[PDB]
């Protein structure tokens, strides 16, 4: 009953990506992916080892995990691709379930475990092939994240990028907007991929 992908039997992640499209994309269209998830049990990581990397009650990782359900908590390590300047920075997420729900998606950007930006969005299900799909596509990236990317892309050494990213995390909480129950909580930690390798990720289950 341990998960093979990022999701539960009640809500699954289908695709997730953070990207930038250059201004010259109107002609020859192209996108650059900083991170990308597209969907043998997943490895496990203890959750209290990453409490210091996210806020505390309320809104903190130890509290949502205390309230459960445990199987809905995942950790994603990203190796971001940061070699790609007034384009469009956006995030696209798509989920799937067999119940018809209205989703609330909270994204907490954190620096040194302290919330710096939060975005809360709502998306109601749309039925397709017997499955309910949720599309939060091309959500505009906060200016803070765009500036952090620009500041972070000009650092002279990649080890400095990783030193800065050591204290940069994101916490996504997806809840049933109606019933107020948590469906999927994802913790994101970041490193920079080497310029030649593209984005990469490794998904873990958060256990205790
Ligand atoms: C700035 C922000 O919170 C936001 C705005 C629009 C969509 C998503 C998000 N948050 C977010 C969540 C997960 C990953 C990322 C990433 F861009 F990969 F850093 C941003």
From Swiss-Prot:
Task: List localization entries.
Answer: Nucleus
Give the top-rank taxon of the lineage listed in the UniProt record for this protein. Eukaryota
Enumerate the residue ranges of region (Transcriptional activation): 1-208
Function in brief: Transcription factor which plays a key role in the Hippo signaling pathway, a pathway involved in organ size control and tumor suppression by restricting proliferation and promoting apoptosis. The core of this pathway is composed of a kinase cascade wherein MST1/MST2, in complex with its regulatory protein SAV1, phosphorylates and activates LATS1/2 in complex with its regulatory protein MOB1, which in turn phosphorylates and inactivates YAP1 oncoprotein and WWTR1/TAZ.
**Subunit arrangement?**
Interacts with YAP1 and WWTR1/TAZ.
Name of this protein = Transcriptional enhancer factor TEF-4
